[PDB]
Curated annotation (Swiss-Prot), chains C, D:
Compartments, record wording: Membrane
Observed effect of gene inactivation: The mice are viable and appear to be of normal size, behavior and reproductive ability. There is no effect on the ability to combat vaginal viral infection, but antiviral response evoked by Toll-like receptor (TLR) stimulation is reduced. Mice also display enhanced rotavirus susceptibility associated with epithelial vacuolization, villus deformation and epithelial cell disruption.
Official protein name in the record: Interferon lambda receptor 1
Organism, as annotated: Mus musculus
Role according to the record: The IFNLR1/IL10RB dimer is a receptor for the cytokine ligands IFNL2 and IFNL3 and mediates their antiviral activity. The ligand/receptor complex stimulate the activation of the JAK/STAT signaling pathway leading to the expression of IFN-stimulated genes (ISG), which contribute to the antiviral state. Determines the cell type specificity of the lambda interferon action. Shows a more restricted pattern of expression in the epithelial tissues thereby limiting responses to lambda interferons primarily to epithelial cells of the respiratory, gastrointestinal, and reproductive tracts.
Annotated family: Belongs to the type II cytokine receptor family.
Subunit and partners: Heterodimer with IL10RB.
Gene name of the encoded protein: Ifnlr1
Post-translational modification: Ubiquitinated by FBXO45-containing E3 ligase leading to proteasomal degradation.
Amino acid sequence: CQPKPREISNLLVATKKAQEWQPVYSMSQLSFDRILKKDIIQGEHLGRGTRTHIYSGTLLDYEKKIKVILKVLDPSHRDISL
Amino acid sequence: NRIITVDDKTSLRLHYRMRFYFTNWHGTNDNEQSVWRHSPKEATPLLDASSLEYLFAQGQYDLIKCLAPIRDPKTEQDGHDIENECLGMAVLAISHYAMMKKMQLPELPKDISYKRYIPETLNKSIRQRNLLTRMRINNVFKDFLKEFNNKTICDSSVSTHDLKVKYLATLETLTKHYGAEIFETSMLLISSENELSRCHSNDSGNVLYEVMVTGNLGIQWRQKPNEEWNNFSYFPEITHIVIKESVVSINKQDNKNMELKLSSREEALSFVSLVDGYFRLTADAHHYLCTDVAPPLIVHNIQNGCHGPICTEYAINKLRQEGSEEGMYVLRWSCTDFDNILMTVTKQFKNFQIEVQKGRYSLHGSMDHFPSLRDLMNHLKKQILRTDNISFVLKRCCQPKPREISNLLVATKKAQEWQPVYSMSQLSFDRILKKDIIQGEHLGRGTRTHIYSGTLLDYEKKIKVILKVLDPSHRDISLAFFEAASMMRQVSHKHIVYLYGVCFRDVENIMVEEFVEGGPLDLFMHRKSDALTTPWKFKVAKQLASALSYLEDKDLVHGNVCTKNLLLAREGIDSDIGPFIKLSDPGIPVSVLTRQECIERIPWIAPECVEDSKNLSVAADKWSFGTTLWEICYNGEIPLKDKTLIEKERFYESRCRPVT
Amino acid sequence: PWFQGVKTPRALDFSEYRYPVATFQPSGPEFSDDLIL
Amino acid sequence: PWFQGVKTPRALDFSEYRYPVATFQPSGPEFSDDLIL
Ligand SMILES: Nc1ncnc2c1ncn2[C@@H]1O[C@H](CO)[C@@H](O)[C@H]1O
């Protein structure tokens, strides 16, 4: 067995400043931001990825009229939504 | 609200004092967080300039007259140091008087003597000592005065306003438990009604206790020594207070209770008034806790709808949120005059002044008058108003909202933690792996939802749960499903069911919920119709009200408050133990329902939601609670049955009263 | 005993100052004339 | 000047104490005997 990067042990010394650099725990939380369907505008086709389709698009009222890329999961592969 | 009667024989003497106090209002002491009023989008100072002078005089009188207790020493060194600091305080006060008199120390030394500026007990103690010490302390006082009156004033450029805050800050720490009131009693009961517990804490011993209330900490109690205090609650956590003769009861949001006895009714009222006053300063300025101590002005404001002495910017901002349509207006008391009300009407924002005199109301610039403010408003409603080139008609008034933030409220460190969190667009929930659940038999069908029994493994082990599955044919509303699941994650109350998480399995989505074996309250009310008693019904209503209040405080909305969503955890019919109920999940929102399905929820669904679904807000719950109260008292009888859909619509349209 | 010790009071110094709120500035117009339909 | 002032050093009092780690306790067995296939 071999050591691992940033492996915690009694060799390390804890300090207040270094306390903020510790990683956060997200073992099972799923969190994301919702965008309302009225703020996006779908554009032309750009190509196909791995079971994914890509279109150009524009986002409104986030300045205004900003250009973005839209990636859509294929309809026939919804089982992998997780 | 105490009534004072004079009948040519009574004689009494009173004092006009500042009662409510917050410690460390000044920012001098950096060891603790300061306090400040809220401001519209530095921090506003708490006290006005005029009030500070009277507070200074009150503090000086308290110190000199020995009404407040002076701290006792812990050794000889600090025993002399406290006397030294008191002499310094006397120096500060006499220097303030000399400066305000606009004359120097040598100009008027005739009336100078430090005896009139120390607590009487300390003066008596010194008088019993040797003459040489008296001469030496006189010399020290004179030298200190001479030094401060010439060197410090130019060294620091201290003004008349500068010394008062230092005086008050020093008195805050030189005095024992300053700015607090403490009560003594021989009996004290603390109760809690956790599930199947009903823990009657405390004992029947003869020991005595003490209760202390302060602005920055709340309510604390302990046994009187022959020990550190233990915290009971802070002001925003209280719900209501009730007086039984001379016994005071305090009730919290988590159903915890405190009950204690005082000397007499006067003491009970004095105790209740302090807490009721603090609640308005810290929690909400448009509410009162106990009916027995309600000030008349707050009652008048609640009946009519006038705001307090709020700032103009807040009033302007409120009108903008309502679309700024012509005819809407806001009433608020003038910030300077005790008899004028500023009707702000709306783009344009015109002001008007209403004069109030000896109970007679009349608009400024007219001779006709009315005996009631509401009457004056009603008369003014139907006329057409003229100002410059524009004419308009008033249509509707704006009203305050619960826990509305304004400059009336006071911010503190303790109250800072009670502020709501922002979750405007975040959707968050916990994932459950498909291998940990086991699906059971069918249990029935809900609104576009199927329910199955099930078991959860390795969370103890082999725990029983309820599984709710969205219908396959209605996957378009998956956003509502996720929103409901996210909402249920934030709540934590003993009368609401617990949500374990959501499990993803192929295309299906599953919600995992606690299992309550008593079943819906509706069926139990149906079967045990004859055995029910009045206290049972009141106990049922109280818990539902408490849960809805908790939901209101966090600004969440539950759209299906009905009897079908009440689950029995304990029947309590057999013996003294009361029933226990829990409130289910919100379910499918009304926003995705058709026109016809909105009709069938009459009279549970609010009318403004029938008019337009986007109008949903927290106020819709208070209608469903009223309907549910009627449903309870008649053994679960179906309200407004046998009416067709068109008749139900006519009921809402004609503004008729549905049930009595 | 006390004659051997001379020390200035600790509370007689000042630092960082303080300030209350001054007042609100009065203001109010009036142009009210009424008519009846 | 200084003869009129006598005060004990502020650092000569003690409170709440302190403590370092003592040591690690030595321990180790050995039962090694080797064989070849
Ligand atoms: N949230 C819930 N908690 C416990 N049991 C429930 C819940 N929803 C439905 N049930 C059960 O479903 C059946 C009626 O639909 C009853 O057995 C009832 O206990």
